[PDB]
């Protein structure tokens, strides 16, 4: 199923629900223990974890430094350890099975921090930072290396993308998308990385674009149907999903989908509320 955890609907929601795209179903799942928008979700073993982000409430608003993580055999969540930082609109990628959590903000703070997660013994510890401060930043993981993709620096959106090597700890530029994106969706799709969505200070977009390694370029490819920023991304069975986003007016509920050897995008589903912010991932069904 597609999980999508958080969001943004005038405060921070809860909500964790998982769409099976073949029964066409939402399923109602725990709620976050605390409400946290511009968060990421990720999944290492078979597990779902929610990544920073930030509590908009009516009360007061906080950004989040909070790892926790949700386990699908029993429906519930745990806490787990926080990072260094709080890090609102971050953005993470899992290579070697540890969490990389990339850029984001804290109050006035534009990060370009970055730190690992080892499930394995529940501790952070921070890597070498990025070239360039990078807020609502998209991240994905291609052979091994992990990829920071546009962004907000606190005075200027981003095309530019840089690459992190793991075993050298160090940030590369590489070449910079054609489009200026922040709060864009990012992901891995068969063997490039897609740019789909984001805002570049004037306008919500729907365009997508594609790097390919061996040619090191970006290519535009299908648009969406819907210009979103902050929208959600995943990949389902070799076909990519963008769930909600904003669009300058309005929360969208709409799902879109990916079909790349026919290159087209369509609707697939309506989420249950409108919503930007969320942070989705993939994982085996909840035990009914």
Not at 143 to 160: E, I, K
Request: charged fraction near 20%; hydrophobic fraction near 35%.
């Amino acid at each position: 199923l597609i999980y999508t955890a958080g969001g943004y609907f005038r405060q921070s929601l809860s909500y964790l629900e998982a769409y099976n795209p073949s029964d066409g179903t939402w399923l109602r799942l725990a709620d976050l223990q605390v409400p946290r928008s511009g968060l990421a979700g990720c999944v290492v073993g078979g597990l779902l974890y929610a990544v920073g982000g930030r509590n908009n409430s009516p009360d007061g608003n906080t950004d989040s430094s909070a790892l926790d993580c949700y386990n699908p055999m029993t429906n519930q969540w745990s806490p787990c350890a926080p990072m260094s930082v709080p890090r609102n609109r971050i953005g993470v990628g899992v290579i070697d099975g540890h969490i990389y959590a990339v850029g984001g903000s804290h109050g006035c703070i534009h990060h370009n921090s970055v730190e690992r997660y080892e499930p394995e013994r529940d501790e952070w510890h921070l890597v070498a930072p990025m070239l360039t401060r990078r807020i609502g930043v998209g991240v994905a993981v291609l052979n091994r290396l992990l990829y920071a993709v546009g962004g907000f620096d606190g005075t200027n959106r981003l095309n530019s993308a840089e690459c992190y090597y793991p075993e050298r700890n160090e940030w590369r530029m590489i070449t910079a998308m054609n489009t200026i994106r922040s709060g864009a969706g990012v992901c891995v799709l068969h063997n490039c990385i897609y740019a789909a969505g984001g805002y570049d200070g004037q306008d919500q977009l729907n365009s997508v674009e594609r790097y390919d390694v061996a040619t090191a370029t970006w290519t535009f490819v299908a648009p969406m149907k819907h210009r979103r920023s902050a929208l959600g991304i995943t990949v389902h069975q070799g076909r990519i999903y963008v769930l909600g986003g904003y669009d300058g007016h309005t929360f969208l509920d709409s799902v879109e989908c990916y079909d790349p050897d026919t290159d087209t995008w369509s609707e697939v589903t309506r989420m249950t509320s409108g919503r930007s912010g969320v942070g989705v991932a993939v994982t085996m069904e909840p035990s009914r």
